[PDB]
Short mmCIF file of C-alpha atoms in Angstrom, two decimals:
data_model
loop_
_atom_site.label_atom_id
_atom_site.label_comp_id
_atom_site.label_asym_id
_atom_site.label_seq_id
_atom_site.Cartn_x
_atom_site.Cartn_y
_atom_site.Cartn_z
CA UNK A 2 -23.68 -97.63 23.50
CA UNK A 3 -25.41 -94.61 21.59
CA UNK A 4 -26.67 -93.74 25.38
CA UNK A 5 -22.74 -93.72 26.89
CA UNK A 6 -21.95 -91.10 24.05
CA UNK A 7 -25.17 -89.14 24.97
CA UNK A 8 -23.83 -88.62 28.55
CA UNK A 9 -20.54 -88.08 28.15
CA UNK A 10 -21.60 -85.74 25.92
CA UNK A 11 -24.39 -83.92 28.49
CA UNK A 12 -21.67 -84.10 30.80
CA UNK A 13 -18.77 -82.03 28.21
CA UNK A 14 -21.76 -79.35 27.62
CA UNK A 15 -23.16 -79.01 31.36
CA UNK A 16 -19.40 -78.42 32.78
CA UNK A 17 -18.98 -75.92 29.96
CA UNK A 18 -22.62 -74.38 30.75
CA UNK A 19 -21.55 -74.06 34.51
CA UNK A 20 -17.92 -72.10 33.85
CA UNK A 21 -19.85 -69.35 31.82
CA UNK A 22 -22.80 -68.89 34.69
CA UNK A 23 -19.18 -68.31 37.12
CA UNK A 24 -18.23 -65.51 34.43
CA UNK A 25 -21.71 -64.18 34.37
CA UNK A 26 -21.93 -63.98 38.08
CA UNK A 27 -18.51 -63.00 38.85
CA UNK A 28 -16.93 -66.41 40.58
CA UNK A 29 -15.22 -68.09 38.05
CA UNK A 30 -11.53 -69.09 38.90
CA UNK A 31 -8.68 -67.09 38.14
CA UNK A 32 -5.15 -66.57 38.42
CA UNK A 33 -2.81 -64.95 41.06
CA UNK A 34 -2.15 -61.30 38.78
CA UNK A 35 -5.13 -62.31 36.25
CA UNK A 36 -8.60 -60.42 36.46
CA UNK A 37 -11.84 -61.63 36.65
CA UNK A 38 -14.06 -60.83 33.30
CA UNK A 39 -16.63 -58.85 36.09
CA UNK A 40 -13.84 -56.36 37.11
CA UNK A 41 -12.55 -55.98 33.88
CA UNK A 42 -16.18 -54.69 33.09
CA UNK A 43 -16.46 -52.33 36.38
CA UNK A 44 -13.55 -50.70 35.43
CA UNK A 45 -14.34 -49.88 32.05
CA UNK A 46 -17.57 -48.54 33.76
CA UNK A 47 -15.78 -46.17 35.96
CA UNK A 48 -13.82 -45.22 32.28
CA UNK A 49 -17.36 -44.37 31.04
CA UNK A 50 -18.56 -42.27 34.52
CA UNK A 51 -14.89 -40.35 33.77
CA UNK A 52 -16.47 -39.77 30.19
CA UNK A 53 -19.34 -38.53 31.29
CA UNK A 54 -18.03 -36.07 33.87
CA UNK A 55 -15.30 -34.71 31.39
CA UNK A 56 -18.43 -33.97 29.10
CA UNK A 57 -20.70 -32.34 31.75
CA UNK A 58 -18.02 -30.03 33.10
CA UNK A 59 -17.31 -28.83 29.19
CA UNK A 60 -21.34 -28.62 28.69
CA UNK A 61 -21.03 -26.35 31.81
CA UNK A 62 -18.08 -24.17 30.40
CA UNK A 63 -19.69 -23.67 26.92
CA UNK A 64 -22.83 -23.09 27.94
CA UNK A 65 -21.36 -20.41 30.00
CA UNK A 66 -19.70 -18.85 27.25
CA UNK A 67 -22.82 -18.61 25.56
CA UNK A 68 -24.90 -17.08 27.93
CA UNK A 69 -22.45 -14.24 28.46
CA UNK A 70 -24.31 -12.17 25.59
CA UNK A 86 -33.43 -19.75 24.83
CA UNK A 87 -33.61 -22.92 22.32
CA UNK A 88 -30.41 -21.88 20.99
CA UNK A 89 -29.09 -22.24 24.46
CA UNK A 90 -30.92 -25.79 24.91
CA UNK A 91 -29.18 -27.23 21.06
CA UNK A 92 -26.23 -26.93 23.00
CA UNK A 93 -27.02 -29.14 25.98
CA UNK A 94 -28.88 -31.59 23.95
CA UNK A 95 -25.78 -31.90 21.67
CA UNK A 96 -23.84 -32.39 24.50
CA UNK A 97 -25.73 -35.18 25.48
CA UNK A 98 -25.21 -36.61 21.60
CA UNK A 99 -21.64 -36.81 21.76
CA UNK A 100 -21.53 -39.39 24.28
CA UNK A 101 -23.71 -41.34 21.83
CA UNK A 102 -20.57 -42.96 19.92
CA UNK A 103 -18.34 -43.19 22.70
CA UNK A 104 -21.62 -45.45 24.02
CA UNK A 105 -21.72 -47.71 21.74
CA UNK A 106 -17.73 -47.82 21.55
CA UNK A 107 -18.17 -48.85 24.53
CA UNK A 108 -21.10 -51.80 23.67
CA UNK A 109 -17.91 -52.89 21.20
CA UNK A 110 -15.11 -52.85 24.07
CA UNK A 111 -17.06 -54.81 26.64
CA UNK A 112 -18.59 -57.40 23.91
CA UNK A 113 -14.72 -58.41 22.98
CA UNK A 114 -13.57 -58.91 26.45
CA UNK A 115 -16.58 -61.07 27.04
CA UNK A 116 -16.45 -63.17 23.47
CA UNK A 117 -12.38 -64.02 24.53
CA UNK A 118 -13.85 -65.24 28.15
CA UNK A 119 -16.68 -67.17 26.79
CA UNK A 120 -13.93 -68.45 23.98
CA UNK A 121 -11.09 -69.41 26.78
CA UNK A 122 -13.89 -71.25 28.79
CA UNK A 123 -13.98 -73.29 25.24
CA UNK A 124 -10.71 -73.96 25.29
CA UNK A 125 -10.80 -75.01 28.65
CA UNK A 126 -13.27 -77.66 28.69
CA UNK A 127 -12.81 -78.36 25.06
CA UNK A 128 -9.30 -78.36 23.96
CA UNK A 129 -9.18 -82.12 23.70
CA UNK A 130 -12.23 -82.24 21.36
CA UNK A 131 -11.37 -79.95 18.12
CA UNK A 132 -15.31 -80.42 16.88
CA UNK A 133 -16.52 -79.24 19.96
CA UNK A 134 -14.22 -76.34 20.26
CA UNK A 135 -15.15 -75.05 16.82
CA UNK A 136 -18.76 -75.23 17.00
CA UNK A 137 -18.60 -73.85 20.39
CA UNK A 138 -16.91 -70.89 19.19
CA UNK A 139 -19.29 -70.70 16.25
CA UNK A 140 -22.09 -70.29 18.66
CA UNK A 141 -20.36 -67.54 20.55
CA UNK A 142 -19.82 -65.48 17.21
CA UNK A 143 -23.42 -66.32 16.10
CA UNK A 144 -25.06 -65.02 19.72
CA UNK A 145 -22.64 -61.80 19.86
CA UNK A 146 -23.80 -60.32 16.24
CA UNK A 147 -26.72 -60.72 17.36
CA UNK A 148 -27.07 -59.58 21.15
CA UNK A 149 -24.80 -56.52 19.53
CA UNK A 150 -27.00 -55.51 16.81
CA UNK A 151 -29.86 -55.30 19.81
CA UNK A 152 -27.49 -53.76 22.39
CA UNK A 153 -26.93 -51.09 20.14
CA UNK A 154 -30.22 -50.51 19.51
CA UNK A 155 -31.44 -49.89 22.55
CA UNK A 156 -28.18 -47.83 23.55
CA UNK A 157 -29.36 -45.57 20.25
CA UNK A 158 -33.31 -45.48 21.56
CA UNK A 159 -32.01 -44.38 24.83
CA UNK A 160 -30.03 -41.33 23.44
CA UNK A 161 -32.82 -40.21 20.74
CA UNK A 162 -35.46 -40.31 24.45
CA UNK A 163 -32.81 -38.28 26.18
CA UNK A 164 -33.21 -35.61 23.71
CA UNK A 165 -36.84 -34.53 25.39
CA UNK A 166 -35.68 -31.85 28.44
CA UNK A 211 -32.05 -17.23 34.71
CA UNK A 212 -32.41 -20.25 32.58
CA UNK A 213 -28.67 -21.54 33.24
CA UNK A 214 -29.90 -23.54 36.11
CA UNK A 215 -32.64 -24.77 34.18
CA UNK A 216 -30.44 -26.26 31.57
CA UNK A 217 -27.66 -27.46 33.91
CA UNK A 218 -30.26 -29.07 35.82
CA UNK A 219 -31.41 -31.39 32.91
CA UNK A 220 -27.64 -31.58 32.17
CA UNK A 221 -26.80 -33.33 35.00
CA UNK A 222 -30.03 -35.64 34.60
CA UNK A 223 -29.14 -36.75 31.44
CA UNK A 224 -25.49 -37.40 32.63
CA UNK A 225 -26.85 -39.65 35.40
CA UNK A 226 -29.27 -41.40 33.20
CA UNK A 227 -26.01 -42.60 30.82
CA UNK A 228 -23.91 -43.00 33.02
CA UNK A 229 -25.56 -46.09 35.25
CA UNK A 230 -28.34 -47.14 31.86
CA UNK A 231 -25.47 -47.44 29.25
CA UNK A 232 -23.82 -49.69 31.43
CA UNK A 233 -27.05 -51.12 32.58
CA UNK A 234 -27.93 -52.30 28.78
CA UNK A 235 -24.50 -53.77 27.74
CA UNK A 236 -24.76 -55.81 30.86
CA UNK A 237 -27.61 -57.07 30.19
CA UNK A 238 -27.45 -57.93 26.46
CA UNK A 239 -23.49 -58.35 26.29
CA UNK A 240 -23.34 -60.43 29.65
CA UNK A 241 -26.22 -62.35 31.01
CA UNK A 242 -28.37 -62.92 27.71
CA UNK A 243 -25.04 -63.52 25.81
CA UNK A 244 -24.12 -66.49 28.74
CA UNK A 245 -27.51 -67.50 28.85
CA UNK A 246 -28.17 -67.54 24.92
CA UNK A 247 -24.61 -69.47 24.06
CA UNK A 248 -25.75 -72.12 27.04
CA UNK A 249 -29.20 -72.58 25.40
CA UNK A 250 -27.20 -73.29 21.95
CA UNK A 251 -24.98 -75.58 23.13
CA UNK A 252 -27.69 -77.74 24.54
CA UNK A 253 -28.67 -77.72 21.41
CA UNK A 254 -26.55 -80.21 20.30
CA UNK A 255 -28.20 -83.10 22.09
CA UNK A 256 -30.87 -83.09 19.45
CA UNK A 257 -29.36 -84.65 16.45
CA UNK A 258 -27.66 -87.58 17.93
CA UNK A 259 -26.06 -88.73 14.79
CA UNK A 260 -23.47 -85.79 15.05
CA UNK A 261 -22.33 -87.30 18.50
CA UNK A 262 -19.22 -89.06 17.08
CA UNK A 263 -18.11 -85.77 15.58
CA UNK A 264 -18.46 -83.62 18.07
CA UNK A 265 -16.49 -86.12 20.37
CA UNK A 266 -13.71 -86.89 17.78
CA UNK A 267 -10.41 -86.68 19.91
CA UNK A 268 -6.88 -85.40 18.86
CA UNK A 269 -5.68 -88.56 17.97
CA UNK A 270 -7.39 -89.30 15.47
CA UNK A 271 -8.21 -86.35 13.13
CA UNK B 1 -57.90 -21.23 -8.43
CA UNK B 2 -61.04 -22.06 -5.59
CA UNK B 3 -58.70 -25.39 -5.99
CA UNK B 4 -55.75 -23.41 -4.11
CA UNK B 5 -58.34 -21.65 -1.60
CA UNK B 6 -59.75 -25.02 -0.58
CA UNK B 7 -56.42 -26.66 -0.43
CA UNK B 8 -55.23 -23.54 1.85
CA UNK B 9 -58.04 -23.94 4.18
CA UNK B 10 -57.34 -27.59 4.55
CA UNK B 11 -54.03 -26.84 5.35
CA UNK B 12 -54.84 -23.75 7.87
CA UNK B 13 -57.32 -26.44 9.57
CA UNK B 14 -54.59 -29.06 10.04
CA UNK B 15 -51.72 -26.96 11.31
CA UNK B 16 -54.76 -25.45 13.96
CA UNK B 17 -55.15 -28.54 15.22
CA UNK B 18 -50.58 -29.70 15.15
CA UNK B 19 -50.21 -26.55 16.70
CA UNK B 20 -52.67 -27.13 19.50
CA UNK B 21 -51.07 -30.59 19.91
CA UNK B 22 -47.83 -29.34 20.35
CA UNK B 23 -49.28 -27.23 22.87
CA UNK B 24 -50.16 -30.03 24.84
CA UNK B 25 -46.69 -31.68 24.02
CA UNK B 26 -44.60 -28.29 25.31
CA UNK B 27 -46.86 -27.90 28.03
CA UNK B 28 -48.14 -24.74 26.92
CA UNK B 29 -51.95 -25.45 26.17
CA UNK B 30 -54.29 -23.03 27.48
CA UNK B 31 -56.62 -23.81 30.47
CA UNK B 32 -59.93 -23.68 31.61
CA UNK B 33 -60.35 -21.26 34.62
CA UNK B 34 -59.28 -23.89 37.59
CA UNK B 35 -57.86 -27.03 35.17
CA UNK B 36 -54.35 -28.10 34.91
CA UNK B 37 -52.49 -28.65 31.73
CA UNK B 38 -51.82 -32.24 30.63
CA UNK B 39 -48.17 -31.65 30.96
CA UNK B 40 -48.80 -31.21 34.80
CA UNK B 41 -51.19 -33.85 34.94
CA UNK B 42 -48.36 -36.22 34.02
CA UNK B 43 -46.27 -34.66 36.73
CA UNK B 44 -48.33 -35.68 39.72
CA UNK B 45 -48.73 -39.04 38.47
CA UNK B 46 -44.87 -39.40 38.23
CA UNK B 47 -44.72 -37.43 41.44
CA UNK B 48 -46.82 -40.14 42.61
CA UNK B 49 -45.06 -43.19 41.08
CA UNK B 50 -41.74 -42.06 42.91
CA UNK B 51 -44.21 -42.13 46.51
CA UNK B 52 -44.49 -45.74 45.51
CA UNK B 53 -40.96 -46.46 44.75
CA UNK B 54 -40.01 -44.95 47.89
CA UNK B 55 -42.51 -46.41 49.97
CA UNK B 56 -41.53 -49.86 48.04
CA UNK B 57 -38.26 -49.20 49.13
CA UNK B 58 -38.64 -48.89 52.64
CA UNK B 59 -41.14 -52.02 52.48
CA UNK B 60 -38.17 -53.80 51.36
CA UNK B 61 -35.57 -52.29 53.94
CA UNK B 62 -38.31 -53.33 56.88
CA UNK B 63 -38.72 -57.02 55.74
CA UNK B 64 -35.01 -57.28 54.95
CA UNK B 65 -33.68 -56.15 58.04
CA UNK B 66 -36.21 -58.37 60.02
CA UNK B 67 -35.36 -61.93 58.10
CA UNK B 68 -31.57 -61.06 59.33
CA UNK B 69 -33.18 -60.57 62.79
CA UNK B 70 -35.48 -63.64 62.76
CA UNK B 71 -32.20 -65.53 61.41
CA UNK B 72 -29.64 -64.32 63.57
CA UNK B 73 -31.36 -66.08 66.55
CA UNK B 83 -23.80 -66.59 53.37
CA UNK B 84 -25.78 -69.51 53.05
CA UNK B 85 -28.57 -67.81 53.12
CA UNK B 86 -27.66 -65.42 50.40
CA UNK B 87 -30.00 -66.84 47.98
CA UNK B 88 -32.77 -66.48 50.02
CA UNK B 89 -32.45 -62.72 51.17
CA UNK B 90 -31.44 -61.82 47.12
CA UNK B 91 -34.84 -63.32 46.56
CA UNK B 92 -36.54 -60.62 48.69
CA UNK B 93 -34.52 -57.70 47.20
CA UNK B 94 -35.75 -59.29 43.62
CA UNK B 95 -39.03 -59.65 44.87
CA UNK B 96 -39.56 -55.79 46.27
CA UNK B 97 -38.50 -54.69 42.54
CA UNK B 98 -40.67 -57.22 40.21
CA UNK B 99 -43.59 -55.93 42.22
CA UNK B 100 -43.45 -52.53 40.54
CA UNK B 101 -43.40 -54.01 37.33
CA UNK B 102 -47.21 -53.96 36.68
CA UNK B 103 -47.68 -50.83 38.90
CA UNK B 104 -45.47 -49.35 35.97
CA UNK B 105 -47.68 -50.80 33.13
CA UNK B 106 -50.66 -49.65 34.88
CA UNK B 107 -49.29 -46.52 35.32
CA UNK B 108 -48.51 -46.44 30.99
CA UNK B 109 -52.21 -47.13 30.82
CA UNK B 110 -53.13 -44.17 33.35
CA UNK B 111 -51.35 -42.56 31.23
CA UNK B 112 -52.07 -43.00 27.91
CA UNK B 113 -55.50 -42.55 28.55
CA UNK B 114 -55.23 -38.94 29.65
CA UNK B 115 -53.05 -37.74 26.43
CA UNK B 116 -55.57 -39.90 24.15
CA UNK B 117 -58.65 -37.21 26.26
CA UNK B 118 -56.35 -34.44 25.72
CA UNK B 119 -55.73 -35.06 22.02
CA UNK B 120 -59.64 -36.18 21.50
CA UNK B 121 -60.74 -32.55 23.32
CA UNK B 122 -57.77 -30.58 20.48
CA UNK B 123 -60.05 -32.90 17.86
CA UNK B 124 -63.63 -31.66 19.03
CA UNK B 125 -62.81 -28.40 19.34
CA UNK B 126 -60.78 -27.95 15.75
CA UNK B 127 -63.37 -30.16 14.20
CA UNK B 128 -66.56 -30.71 15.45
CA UNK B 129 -68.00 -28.76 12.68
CA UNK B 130 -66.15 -31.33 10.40
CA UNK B 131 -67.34 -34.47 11.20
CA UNK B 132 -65.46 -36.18 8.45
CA UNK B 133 -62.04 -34.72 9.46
CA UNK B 134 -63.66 -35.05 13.15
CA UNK B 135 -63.36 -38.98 12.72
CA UNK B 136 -60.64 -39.55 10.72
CA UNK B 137 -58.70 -37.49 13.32
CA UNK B 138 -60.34 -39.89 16.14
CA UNK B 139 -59.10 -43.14 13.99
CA UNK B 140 -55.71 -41.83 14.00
CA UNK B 141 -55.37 -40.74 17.24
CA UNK B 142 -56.52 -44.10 18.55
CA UNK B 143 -54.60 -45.86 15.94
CA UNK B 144 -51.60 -44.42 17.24
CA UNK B 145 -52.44 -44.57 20.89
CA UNK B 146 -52.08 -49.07 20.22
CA UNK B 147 -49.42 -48.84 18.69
CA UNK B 148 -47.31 -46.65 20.87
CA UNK B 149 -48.59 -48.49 24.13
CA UNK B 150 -47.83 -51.32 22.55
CA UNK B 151 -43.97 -50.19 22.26
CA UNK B 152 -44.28 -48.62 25.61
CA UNK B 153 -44.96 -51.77 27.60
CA UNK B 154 -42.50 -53.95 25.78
CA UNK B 155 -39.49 -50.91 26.45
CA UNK B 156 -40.89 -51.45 30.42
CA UNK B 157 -41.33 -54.80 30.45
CA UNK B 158 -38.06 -55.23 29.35
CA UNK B 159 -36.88 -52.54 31.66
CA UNK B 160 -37.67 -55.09 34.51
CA UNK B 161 -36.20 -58.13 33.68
CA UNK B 162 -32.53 -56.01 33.45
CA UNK B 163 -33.26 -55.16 36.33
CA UNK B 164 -33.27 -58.15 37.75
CA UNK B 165 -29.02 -58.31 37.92
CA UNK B 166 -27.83 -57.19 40.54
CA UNK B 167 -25.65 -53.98 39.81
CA UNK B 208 -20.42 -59.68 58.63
CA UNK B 209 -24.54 -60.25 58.19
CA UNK B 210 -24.23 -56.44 58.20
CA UNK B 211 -22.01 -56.37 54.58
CA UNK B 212 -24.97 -58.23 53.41
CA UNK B 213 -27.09 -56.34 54.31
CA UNK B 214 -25.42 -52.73 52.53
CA UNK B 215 -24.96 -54.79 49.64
CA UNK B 216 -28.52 -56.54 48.78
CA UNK B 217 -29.58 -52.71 49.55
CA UNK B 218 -27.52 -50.79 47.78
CA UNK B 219 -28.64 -52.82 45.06
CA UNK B 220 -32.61 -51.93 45.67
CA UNK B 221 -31.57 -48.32 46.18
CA UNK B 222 -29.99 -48.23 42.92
CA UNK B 223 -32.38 -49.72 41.06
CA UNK B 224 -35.15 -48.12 42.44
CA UNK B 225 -33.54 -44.53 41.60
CA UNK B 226 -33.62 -46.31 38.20
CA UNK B 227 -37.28 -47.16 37.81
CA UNK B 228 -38.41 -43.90 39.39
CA UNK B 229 -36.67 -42.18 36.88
CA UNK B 230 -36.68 -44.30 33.71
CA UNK B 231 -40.45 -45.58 33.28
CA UNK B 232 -41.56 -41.88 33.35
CA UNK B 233 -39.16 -41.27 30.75
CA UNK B 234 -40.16 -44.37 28.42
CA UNK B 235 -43.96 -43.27 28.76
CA UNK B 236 -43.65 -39.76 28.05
CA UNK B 237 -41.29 -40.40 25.20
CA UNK B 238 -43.86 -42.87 23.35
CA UNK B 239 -47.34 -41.46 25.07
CA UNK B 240 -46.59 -37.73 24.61
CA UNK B 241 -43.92 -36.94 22.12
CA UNK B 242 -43.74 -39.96 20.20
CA UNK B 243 -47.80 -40.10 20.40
CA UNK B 244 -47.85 -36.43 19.38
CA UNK B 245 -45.35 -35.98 16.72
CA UNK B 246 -47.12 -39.38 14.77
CA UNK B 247 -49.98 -37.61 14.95
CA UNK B 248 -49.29 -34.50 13.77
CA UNK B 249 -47.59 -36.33 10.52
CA UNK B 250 -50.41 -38.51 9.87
CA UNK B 251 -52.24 -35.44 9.77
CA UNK B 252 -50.12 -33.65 7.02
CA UNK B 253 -50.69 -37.01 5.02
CA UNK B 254 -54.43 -35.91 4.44
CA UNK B 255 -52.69 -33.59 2.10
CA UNK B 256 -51.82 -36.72 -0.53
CA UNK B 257 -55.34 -37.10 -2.13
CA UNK B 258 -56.20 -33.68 -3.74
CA UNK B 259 -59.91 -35.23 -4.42
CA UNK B 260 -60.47 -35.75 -1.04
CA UNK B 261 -60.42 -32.30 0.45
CA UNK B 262 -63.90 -31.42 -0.15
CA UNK B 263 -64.72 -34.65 2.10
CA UNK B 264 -62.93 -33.35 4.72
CA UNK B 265 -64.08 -30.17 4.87
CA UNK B 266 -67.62 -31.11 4.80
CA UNK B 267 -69.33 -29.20 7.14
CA UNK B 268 -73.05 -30.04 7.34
#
């Protein structure tokens, strides 16, 4: 029956659909000396609040050496503040990767057996990254171009440390966000896609033995 | 050239008028005997948005640590996360209100900088009124989308009693986050983004030489 394929076929997508909500919440199963995606993306976060403190503490020592002689002191803050900008979105690049090869080892997974499947599913998850990455970065970029708005030492150290707090939990905050849950939630809306044109059915179930 | 002279008083008018906008930008305006400077203005109201955060906060703490009371006399994870979400999409509009509040006191402040650099140029008078108000949509516009969007990331997260710590270390953390971030989206778009649009669609006035004598009517 057309309406056999049609379930089997729900069925292929939904079990797919539910491993990547376990990645995006943190659950899915794992090995005995494997990782879980979700620590593998704290611990580049506590990489990025190590940035962050090696670039406050040289802020603090080159700023000093400056004021042993006003908005030439401040250029030097706020270009402190720039030069995490890179590293930032360096980072937006990192965390997208390690999240593409989960999302593509949950397709080979559930789709190993089904070669049509596996290829489109990894075409979706190519598609969805250029473009949650092109809008992660974005929004990384807005956020450093708004941190540039701020005796006077403590002034200046005072908005140093601000800013350094602000990067340190947003950056993270944003590649979450884009690079995580609307990735998942994006590449699940995709696949579901496929019910639509019910003449591709057959193709997307083709099996091994006979391709 | 009287060409040159009128062109030079055009331009002496206009920078007038960006300089006293960057006053108001740099909070550095000058202020009637017992007023307070826009800049400060801004200040209590983000003095007072981090009352509400904190008082929002608590809220949430009280009713949180009472369902695990009511219940104790994780399968109910999903319904205390839902009160942890709950406490933080209610600040959501209290944040685009806030925008609004706002907005509307730098669109005043940049009306006043108008009337008093050209109230004896009605022409330049308006068309410094249409772009300040053009702006002021636009701007808003980008404003509430950046907060909007603000809230729905924040809702992802990051014994009864580990629970507990957790679900509020996550509204304590985002909290610190929306206290500190929606002030810093509005004055970015409603003060210096506002201002420094402004100013340059001023300077464009400069374009059409024929125009000048419009502007500077002064009947």
């Amino acid at each position: 029956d057309e309406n056999e394929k049609m379930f089997f076929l729900i069925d292929k997508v939904n079990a797919f659909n539910q491993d990547i909500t376990a990645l995006m919440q943190g659950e899915e199963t794992v090995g005995e000396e494997d990782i879980r995606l979700f620590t593998r993306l704290r611990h580049e976060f506590h990489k990025w609040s190590t940035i962050i403190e090696n670039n406050f503490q040289e802020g603090h020592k080159i700023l000093s050496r400056k004021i042993q002689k006003y908005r030439t002191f401040e250029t030097i803050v706020k270009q402190q503040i720039k030069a995490l900008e890179e590293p930032a979105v360096d980072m937006l690049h990192t965390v997208t990767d390690m999240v593409r090869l989960a999302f593509t080892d949950v397709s080979i997974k559930n789709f190993e057996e089904f070669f049509n499947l596996h290829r489109t599913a990894k075409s979706k998850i190519e598609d969805i990254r250029a473009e949650q990455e092109r809008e992660g970065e974005k929004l990384i970029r807005l956020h450093f171009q708004m941190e540039q708005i701020v005796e006077i030492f403590q002034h200046l150290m005072a908005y140093h440390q601000e800013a350094s707090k602000r990067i340190s939990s947003h950056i993270p905050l944003i590649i979450q966000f884009f690079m995580l849950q609307t990735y998942g939630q994006q590449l699940q809306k995709a696949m579901l896609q496929l019910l639509q044109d019910k003449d591709t059915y057959s193709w997307l179930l083709k099996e091994r033995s006979d391709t």
